[PDB]
């Protein structure tokens, strides 16, 4: 029953998920002048050469491109991370118009959308165990700005017509998520949470500084999806972003000078 309408949107979630008002909630505004360069952070290692995409699913809140995470095929390591984190899925959050949609903001700037590549720490053995641990997940966040098309996004855009409504899925094999990355891997990092219920405080956030450019026609196709199920009154899937939460007692670290 939570969602992104007036009646069940982010300002309501705390009633069922009281950790919504916790001490390490996400997303947050990244104040670029306050984030300190940490010459002790490593370069991220994004090792997607062996990624196995399987399926795309409209879950009623976003669409997820799911991967085979039963072995170490597509992993995130390095950066602020200890150990190895397996890619399980990616998804986006976006707006009704290009001036909003991202969950993190940069000096209060909102981007048209934000991609989240979700990985879990193999030392916990499965995703459901990893979300119960403060170092269980690593989510790589990438901003989308509207300009030139992103060629590696078009395969995702073109299948959306087949998963319009909640509970629909489609085969989605052989998709290479390296085509969704920007040139640079410079990033900010901080400890946070899932941004959807149950809002668990289990995420090391790694947010890339360089946005990727996507076309207006590409993000318009995201906005044709539906929150509702088949044959239900149409509620366009737009504005499925949680706003910035209080930073509290946390420090955002930059990987770059
Ligand atoms: N807390 S919640 O967002 O799941 C909800 C259910 C009904 C109203 O608010
Ligand atoms: N949006 S996100 O990447 O923090 C996420 C993954 C699973 C639940 O919430
Ligand atoms: Zn997300």
């Amino acid at each position: 029953h939570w969602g992104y309408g007036k009646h069940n949107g982010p300002e309501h979630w705390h009633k069922d998920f009281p950790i919504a008002k916790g001490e390490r909630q996400s997303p947050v505004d990244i104040d670029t002048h306050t984030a300190k360069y940490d010459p002790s952070l490593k370069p991220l290692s994004v090792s997607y050469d062996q990624a196995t995409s399987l399926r795309i699913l409209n879950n009623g809140h976003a669409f997820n491109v799911e991967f085979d995470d039963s072995q170490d095929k597509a992993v995130l390591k390095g950066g602020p991370l200890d150990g190895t984190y397996r890619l399980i899925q990616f998804h986006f959050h976006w707006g009704s118009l290009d001036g909003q949609g991202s969950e993190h903001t940069v000096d209060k700037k909102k981007y048209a959308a934000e991609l989240h590549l979700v990985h879990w720490n193999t030392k916990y053995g499965d995703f459901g165990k990893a979300v119960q641990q403060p170092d269980g997940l690593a989510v790589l966040g990438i901003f989308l700005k509207v300009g030139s098309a992103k060629p590696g996004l078009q395969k995702v855009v073109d299948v959306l017509d087949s998963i319009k409504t909640k509970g629909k899925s489609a085969d989605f094999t052989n998709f290479d998520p390296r085509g969704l990355l920007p040139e640079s891997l410079d990033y900010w990092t901080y400890p946070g949470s899932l941004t959807t219920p149950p809002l668990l405080e289990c995420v090391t956030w790694i947010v890339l500084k360089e946005p990727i450019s996507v076309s207006s026609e590409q993000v318009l196709k995201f906005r044709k999806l539906n929150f509702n199920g088949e044959g239900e009154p149409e509620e366009l899937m737009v504005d499925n972003w949680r706003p910035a939460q209080p930073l509290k007692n946390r420090q955002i670290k930059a990987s770059f000078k």
Side-chain angles (χ1 to χ4, degrees), residues 2-208 210-256:
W2 61 269
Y4 294 96
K6 213 195 188 328
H7 300 288
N8 60 353
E11 296 319 303
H12 293 268
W13 296 350
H14 72 99
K15 293 174 282 176
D16 292 275
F17 303 95
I19 203 62
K21 289 184 196 295
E23 302 297 303
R24 58 169 283 185
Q25 290 290 291
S26 288
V28 301
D29 181 56
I30 298 166
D31 192 77
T32 64
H33 282 111
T34 300
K36 199 177 172 257
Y37 166 57
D38 185 351
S40 111
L41 285 165
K42 322 170 197 300
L44 258 196
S45 173
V46 182
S47 183
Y48 287 172
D49 185 66
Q50 296 298 115
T52 294
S53 69
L54 289 178
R55 188 179 76 144
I56 193 174
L57 167 71
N58 179 332
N59 64 15
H61 305 291
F63 60 89
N64 285 6
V65 170
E66 291 167 353
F67 289 79
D68 174 11
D69 57 347
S70 70
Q71 304 183 71
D72 290 359
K73 291 189 158 185
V75 297
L76 183 70
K77 298 181 186 155
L81 309 170
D82 296 307
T84 296
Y85 289 72
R86 289 192 190 154
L87 181 62
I88 172 173
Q89 49 105 338
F90 70 78
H91 61 276
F92 303 79
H93 306 265
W94 64 90
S96 47
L97 283 183
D98 298 348
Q100 58 187 34
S102 66
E103 291 203 313
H104 294 90
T105 55
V106 179
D107 298 333
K108 303 291 183 77
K109 180 185 169 81
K110 292 172 171 88
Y111 289 89
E114 184 172 330
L115 168 59
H116 289 163
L117 295 129
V118 179
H119 311 76
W120 59 270
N121 191 334
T122 66
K123 74 187 267 206
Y124 301 121
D126 66 68
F127 182 90
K129 288 290 193 159
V131 303
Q132 304 183 61
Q133 301 292 342
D135 58 351
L137 289 199
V139 184
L140 182 59
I142 298 178
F143 295 118
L144 279 63
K145 60 183 208 192
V146 175
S148 297
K150 186 71 163 174
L153 181 65
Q154 191 61 34
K155 281 183 188 183
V156 172
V157 163
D158 285 328
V159 77
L160 301 183
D161 270 338
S162 77
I163 57 153
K164 182 171 179 178
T165 46
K166 180 180 180 192
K168 297 199 72 177
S169 72
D171 256 75
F172 205 68
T173 46
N174 298 107
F175 175 76
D176 187 352
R178 295 179 290 186
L180 297 178
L181 306 179
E183 173 193 328
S184 183
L185 296 179
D186 288 344
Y187 64 86
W188 297 284
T189 184
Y190 73 99
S193 71
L194 306 185
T195 66
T196 47
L199 300 171
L200 294 171
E201 294 180 333
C202 62
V203 183
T204 300
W205 272 99
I206 296 166
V207 176
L208 293 189
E210 186 185 334
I212 54 163
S213 175
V214 302
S215 64
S216 182
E217 294 79 348
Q218 292 174 321
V219 69
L220 279 162
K221 292 181 179 184
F222 289 11
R223 302 179 182 128
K224 298 188 87 216
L225 294 160
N226 281 187
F227 291 124
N228 53 282
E230 185 178 4
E232 297 176 354
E234 287 200 342
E235 293 176 83
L236 295 179
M237 181 178 282
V238 291
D239 293 321
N240 60 347
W241 53 277
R242 190 192 192 188
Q245 305 297 311
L247 181 67
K248 300 194 175 271
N249 185 222
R250 297 175 286 182
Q251 232 124 348
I252 296 177
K253 293 182 195 144
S255 69
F256 58 87

